[PDB]
């Protein structure tokens, strides 16, 4: 009935690097999605206690959210861009798994996803 702790966002035992793709994912992709009118439900972990959603964490075992992704990028949590992209994909997929299709939240998720997919199509060249 308690919320789980939020996903880890900096790990001292993990190596760190900056890459152009990672920089692009923070400066361009995340920034663009964050501003979106439908972003707000995804800007932080789902507070199942405040929302009175008792089975959210019974069902969703890999929670992810853009506030967490943002923190990860800012603390150099990801070595590879694909790690960041997978986190976004997990976020959207969770929403589809938990919610009935045609729920307001699911529709907001599709809109964000469509944008996200467009943005990662423009991802810059790897070193
Ligand atoms: C529908 C639940 C949900 C949210 C979400 O955020 N809903 C939400 C947040 C606020 S809120 O942030 O205003 N509120 C809570 C702390 C107090 C300020 C207010 C109303 C809401 O419906 N995000 C996701 C991904 C889901 C699911 C279940 O998929």
mmCIF file of C-alpha atoms and ligand atoms in Angstrom:
data_model
loop_
_atom_site.group_PDB
_atom_site.id
_atom_site.type_symbol
_atom_site.label_atom_id
_atom_site.label_comp_id
_atom_site.label_asym_id
_atom_site.label_seq_id
_atom_site.Cartn_x
_atom_site.Cartn_y
_atom_site.Cartn_z
ATOM 1 C CA UNK A 1 0.000 0.000 0.000
ATOM 2 C CA UNK A 2 3.089 2.208 0.339
ATOM 3 C CA UNK A 3 4.647 3.615 -2.819
ATOM 4 C CA UNK A 4 7.871 1.946 -3.917
ATOM 5 C CA UNK A 5 11.027 4.091 -3.799
ATOM 6 C CA UNK A 6 11.595 5.898 -7.089
ATOM 7 C CA UNK A 7 13.937 4.275 -9.612
ATOM 8 C CA UNK A 8 17.648 4.828 -8.964
ATOM 9 C CA UNK A 9 19.009 7.993 -10.657
ATOM 10 C CA UNK A 10 22.713 8.086 -9.826
ATOM 11 C CA UNK A 11 24.905 5.080 -9.137
ATOM 12 C CA UNK A 12 28.494 5.736 -7.997
ATOM 13 C CA UNK A 13 29.616 2.258 -9.045
ATOM 14 C CA UNK A 14 28.642 2.914 -12.661
ATOM 15 C CA UNK A 15 31.049 4.556 -15.144
ATOM 16 C CA UNK A 16 30.111 7.937 -16.668
ATOM 17 C CA UNK A 17 30.450 9.530 -20.094
ATOM 18 C CA UNK A 18 28.938 12.292 -22.176
ATOM 19 C CA UNK A 19 28.030 11.492 -25.785
ATOM 20 C CA UNK A 20 26.386 13.607 -28.457
ATOM 21 C CA UNK A 21 23.341 11.331 -28.541
ATOM 22 C CA UNK A 22 22.919 11.473 -24.759
ATOM 23 C CA UNK A 23 23.304 15.254 -24.867
ATOM 24 C CA UNK A 24 20.740 15.357 -27.677
ATOM 25 C CA UNK A 25 18.311 13.198 -25.657
ATOM 26 C CA UNK A 26 18.474 15.659 -22.742
ATOM 27 C CA UNK A 27 18.754 19.019 -24.585
ATOM 28 C CA UNK A 28 16.323 18.179 -27.390
ATOM 29 C CA UNK A 29 14.158 15.077 -26.970
ATOM 30 C CA UNK A 30 13.362 15.254 -23.274
ATOM 31 C CA UNK A 31 13.106 19.047 -23.270
ATOM 32 C CA UNK A 32 10.602 18.947 -26.109
ATOM 33 C CA UNK A 33 8.427 16.266 -24.488
ATOM 34 C CA UNK A 34 8.543 17.972 -21.105
ATOM 35 C CA UNK A 35 6.935 21.115 -22.527
ATOM 36 C CA UNK A 36 4.048 19.172 -24.096
ATOM 37 C CA UNK A 37 0.564 19.933 -22.902
ATOM 38 C CA UNK A 38 0.013 16.221 -22.081
ATOM 39 C CA UNK A 39 3.367 15.685 -20.298
ATOM 40 C CA UNK A 40 2.297 16.318 -16.702
ATOM 41 C CA UNK A 41 1.059 12.842 -15.825
ATOM 42 C CA UNK A 42 4.485 11.502 -16.882
ATOM 43 C CA UNK A 43 6.778 14.083 -15.238
ATOM 44 C CA UNK A 44 7.133 12.131 -11.976
ATOM 45 C CA UNK A 45 6.589 8.615 -10.643
ATOM 46 C CA UNK A 46 2.944 7.614 -10.288
ATOM 47 C CA UNK A 47 1.934 8.421 -6.730
ATOM 48 C CA UNK A 48 -0.344 5.467 -6.197
ATOM 49 C CA UNK A 49 -1.009 6.478 -2.554
ATOM 50 C CA UNK A 50 -2.109 10.042 -3.384
ATOM 51 C CA UNK A 51 -4.054 8.812 -6.418
ATOM 52 C CA UNK A 52 -5.618 5.921 -4.485
ATOM 53 C CA UNK A 53 -4.422 3.364 -7.034
ATOM 54 C CA UNK A 54 -3.827 0.232 -4.913
ATOM 55 C CA UNK A 55 -2.961 -2.177 -7.752
ATOM 56 C CA UNK A 56 -0.715 0.106 -9.842
ATOM 57 C CA UNK A 57 2.471 -1.352 -8.368
ATOM 58 C CA UNK A 58 0.856 -4.780 -8.063
ATOM 59 C CA UNK A 59 0.753 -4.693 -11.872
ATOM 60 C CA UNK A 60 3.590 -2.414 -12.971
ATOM 61 C CA UNK A 61 6.915 -3.874 -11.863
ATOM 62 C CA UNK A 62 9.206 -1.587 -13.865
ATOM 63 C CA UNK A 63 7.851 1.910 -13.256
ATOM 64 C CA UNK A 64 9.375 4.706 -15.283
ATOM 65 C CA UNK A 65 8.687 8.367 -15.705
ATOM 66 C CA UNK A 66 10.252 11.438 -17.369
ATOM 67 C CA UNK A 67 11.340 13.049 -14.048
ATOM 68 C CA UNK A 68 13.387 9.912 -13.423
ATOM 69 C CA UNK A 69 14.727 9.903 -16.975
ATOM 70 C CA UNK A 70 15.628 13.551 -16.638
ATOM 71 C CA UNK A 71 17.536 12.891 -13.435
ATOM 72 C CA UNK A 72 19.317 9.936 -15.004
ATOM 73 C CA UNK A 73 20.587 12.004 -17.941
ATOM 74 C CA UNK A 74 21.619 14.842 -15.631
ATOM 75 C CA UNK A 75 23.651 12.492 -13.401
ATOM 76 C CA UNK A 76 25.149 10.558 -16.361
ATOM 77 C CA UNK A 77 23.379 7.337 -15.382
ATOM 78 C CA UNK A 78 23.235 6.040 -18.987
ATOM 79 C CA UNK A 79 26.342 4.802 -20.788
ATOM 80 C CA UNK A 80 24.449 4.134 -24.041
ATOM 81 C CA UNK A 81 21.647 6.154 -25.652
ATOM 82 C CA UNK A 82 19.603 3.000 -26.149
ATOM 83 C CA UNK A 83 19.294 2.727 -22.339
ATOM 84 C CA UNK A 84 17.622 6.139 -22.249
ATOM 85 C CA UNK A 85 15.351 5.245 -25.141
ATOM 86 C CA UNK A 86 14.335 2.020 -23.540
ATOM 87 C CA UNK A 87 13.247 3.911 -20.397
ATOM 88 C CA UNK A 88 10.927 6.121 -22.455
ATOM 89 C CA UNK A 89 9.520 3.002 -24.131
ATOM 90 C CA UNK A 90 8.940 1.334 -20.767
ATOM 91 C CA UNK A 91 7.073 4.443 -19.553
ATOM 92 C CA UNK A 92 4.626 4.379 -22.471
ATOM 93 C CA UNK A 93 4.240 0.571 -22.360
ATOM 94 C CA UNK A 94 3.376 0.643 -18.640
ATOM 95 C CA UNK A 95 0.586 3.072 -19.382
ATOM 96 C CA UNK A 96 -0.777 0.813 -22.105
ATOM 97 C CA UNK A 97 -0.561 -2.250 -19.871
ATOM 98 C CA UNK A 98 -2.231 -0.689 -16.820
ATOM 99 C CA UNK A 99 -4.949 1.400 -18.451
ATOM 100 C CA UNK A 100 -7.916 0.482 -20.641
ATOM 101 C CA UNK A 101 -7.504 1.743 -24.175
ATOM 102 C CA UNK A 102 -9.339 5.008 -24.764
ATOM 103 C CA UNK A 103 -8.697 6.173 -21.212
ATOM 104 C CA UNK A 104 -7.715 9.833 -21.183
ATOM 105 C CA UNK A 105 -4.254 8.904 -19.933
ATOM 106 C CA UNK A 106 -3.658 6.339 -22.727
ATOM 107 C CA UNK A 107 -4.531 8.929 -25.368
ATOM 108 C CA UNK A 108 -2.099 11.402 -23.820
ATOM 109 C CA UNK A 109 0.529 8.664 -23.883
ATOM 110 C CA UNK A 110 0.015 7.999 -27.603
ATOM 111 C CA UNK A 111 0.441 11.703 -28.351
ATOM 112 C CA UNK A 112 3.668 11.921 -26.352
ATOM 113 C CA UNK A 113 4.929 8.710 -27.905
ATOM 114 C CA UNK A 114 4.221 9.837 -31.466
ATOM 115 C CA UNK A 115 6.252 12.963 -30.777
ATOM 116 C CA UNK A 116 9.007 10.991 -29.056
ATOM 117 C CA UNK A 117 9.361 8.613 -31.951
ATOM 118 C CA UNK A 118 9.580 11.587 -34.351
ATOM 119 C CA UNK A 119 12.328 13.159 -32.216
ATOM 120 C CA UNK A 120 14.516 10.043 -31.913
ATOM 121 C CA UNK A 121 14.306 9.689 -35.714
ATOM 122 C CA UNK A 122 16.381 12.799 -35.754
ATOM 123 C CA UNK A 123 19.013 11.444 -33.363
ATOM 124 C CA UNK A 124 22.575 12.644 -34.173
ATOM 125 C CA UNK A 125 25.609 10.587 -35.288
ATOM 126 C CA UNK A 126 27.504 8.288 -32.840
ATOM 127 C CA UNK A 127 31.218 8.789 -32.097
HETATM 128 C C1 LIG B 1 -4.074 8.347 -14.109
HETATM 129 C C2 LIG B 1 -2.922 8.117 -13.141
HETATM 130 C C3 LIG B 1 -1.625 8.312 -13.825
HETATM 131 C C4 LIG B 1 -0.859 9.469 -13.809
HETATM 132 C C5 LIG B 1 -1.020 10.746 -13.184
HETATM 133 O O1 LIG B 1 -0.061 11.467 -12.983
HETATM 134 N N1 LIG B 1 -2.307 11.092 -12.855
HETATM 135 C C6 LIG B 1 -2.629 12.246 -12.098
HETATM 136 C C7 LIG B 1 -1.728 13.058 -11.428
HETATM 137 C C8 LIG B 1 -2.229 14.158 -10.737
HETATM 138 S S1 LIG B 1 -1.189 15.303 -9.816
HETATM 139 O O2 LIG B 1 0.223 15.094 -10.097
HETATM 140 O O3 LIG B 1 -1.822 16.609 -9.944
HETATM 141 N N2 LIG B 1 -1.512 14.625 -8.277
HETATM 142 C C9 LIG B 1 -0.928 13.291 -7.995
HETATM 143 C C10 LIG B 1 0.312 13.426 -7.135
HETATM 144 C C11 LIG B 1 -1.468 15.554 -7.127
HETATM 145 C C12 LIG B 1 -0.749 16.816 -7.555
HETATM 146 C C13 LIG B 1 -3.581 14.450 -10.697
HETATM 147 C C14 LIG B 1 -4.469 13.639 -11.367
HETATM 148 C C15 LIG B 1 -3.974 12.552 -12.055
HETATM 149 O O4 LIG B 1 -4.843 11.719 -12.736
HETATM 150 N N3 LIG B 1 0.255 9.224 -14.560
HETATM 151 C C16 LIG B 1 0.230 7.958 -15.062
HETATM 152 C C17 LIG B 1 1.361 7.492 -15.910
HETATM 153 C C18 LIG B 1 -0.942 7.359 -14.622
HETATM 154 C C19 LIG B 1 -1.295 6.002 -14.950
HETATM 155 C C20 LIG B 1 -2.106 5.245 -13.957
HETATM 156 O O5 LIG B 1 -0.915 5.451 -15.976
#
